[PDB]
C-alpha cells in the first residue's frame, strides 16, 4: 500500500506549546496574537480527531521534559503524533521563556529507536517561529 | 530495519535564515493559512497537498505592514521538510 495505516483506536495526541511571555534577559518581546493561533489550532486539530493538550509559557526544561514524557507514553493504539510549536526562534533553535533549545533535541525523542510505539507512524511537527533575521522583499 | 529518522515531517512557517510574520490581531500568517486549509480540506487531501496549499496561501495572501519602511511590504514562504515514507490522510 502507499498510505499510512489509519485504522487505529484513535488518531493520536496533539501537543501545542504556546509561548507568549519570555523572561526579560532573553530580549524577546511578548508574542501578541499567539493565543488566537493556539485557540484556532486547538479547535482545528480537535476537529481532525486528535486528543489535544495545550501548554503555555514553557521553560526550555519544561518543553524538553514534556516531549520526552510524551515519547515514553504508549502510542500503540494511535495512528500518528502531532506537535505544534509557537514561539520565537532563530536558525535551528526555538525559544523557551528562559532561553533557546535545539529543535533537533526536542524532536529526537520520537526517533524510531527511542519511541517504539510510533515506529512506522507519522510524527508531525508544525513550527511557527523565526529561523533567522533575513527579510523577503518579494518580486512581481 | 527502519531508519530511526524516518517518518518525520516538519512544517516550518518560514525558510532557514528568515523571519516569520505574526499579526497581533489575527495571529501568525502560517497558522491562519494552515487552519483555513485544514478546516476546508483536512479530511479529504493528503498532508502534502494541504501544506502545498498553505505555502501558496501564505505566499500570495500576506504582505507585512509597518510604520518602519524597512519592515514594510515584506513576504513569506513556508518550508515543508518530509521524511515520510507513505501518503498521509487524516480520514478512514
Amino acid at each position: 500500500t502507499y498510505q499510512y495505516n489509519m485504522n487505529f483506536e484513535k488518531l493520536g495526541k496533539c501537543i501545542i506549546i504556546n509561548n507568549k511571555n519570555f523572561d526579560k534577559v532573553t530580549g524577546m518581546g511578548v508574542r501578541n496574537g499567539t493565543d488566537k493561533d493556539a485557540e484556532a489550532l486547538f479547535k482545528c486539530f480537535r476537529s481532525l480527531g486528535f486528543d489535544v493538550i495545550v501548554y503555555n509559557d514553557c521553560s526550555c526544561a519544561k518543553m524538553q521534559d514534556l516531549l520526552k514524557k510524551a515519547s515514553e507514553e504508549d502510542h500503540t493504539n494511535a495512528a500518528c503524533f502531532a506537535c505544534i510549536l509557537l514561539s520565537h526562534g532563530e536558525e535551528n533553535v526555538i525559544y523557551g521563556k528562559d532561553g533557546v533549545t535545539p529543535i533537533k533535541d526536542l524532536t529526537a525523542h520520537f526517533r524510531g529507536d527511542r519511541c517504539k510505539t510510533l515506529l512506522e507512524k507519522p510524527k508531525l511537527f508544525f513550527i511557527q517561529a523565526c529561523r533567522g533575521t533575513e527579510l523577503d522583499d518579494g518580486i512581481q | 530495519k527502519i531508519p530511526v529518522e524516518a517518518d518525520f515531517l516538519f512544517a516550518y512557517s518560514t525558510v532557514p535564515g528568515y523571519y516569520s510574520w505574526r499579526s497581533p490581531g489575527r495571529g501568525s500568517w502560517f497558522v491562519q493559512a494552515l487552519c483555513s486549509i485544514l478546516e476546508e480540506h483536512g479530511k479529504d487531501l493528503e498532508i502534502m497537498q494541504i501544506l502545498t496549499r498553505v505555502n501558496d496561501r501564505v505566499a500570495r495572501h500576506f504582505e507585512s505592514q509597518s510604520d518602519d519602511p524597512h519592515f514594510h511590504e515584506k513576504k513569506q514562504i513556508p518550508c515543508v521538510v518530509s521524511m515520510l515514507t507513505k501518503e498521509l490522510y487524516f480520514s478512514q
Binding site: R31, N32, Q128, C130 | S20, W21, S66
Partner: peptide, 4 residues
C-alpha cells in the same frame, strides 16, 4: 505585524 511583528516578527517571530
Amino acid at each position: 505585524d511583528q516578527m517571530x
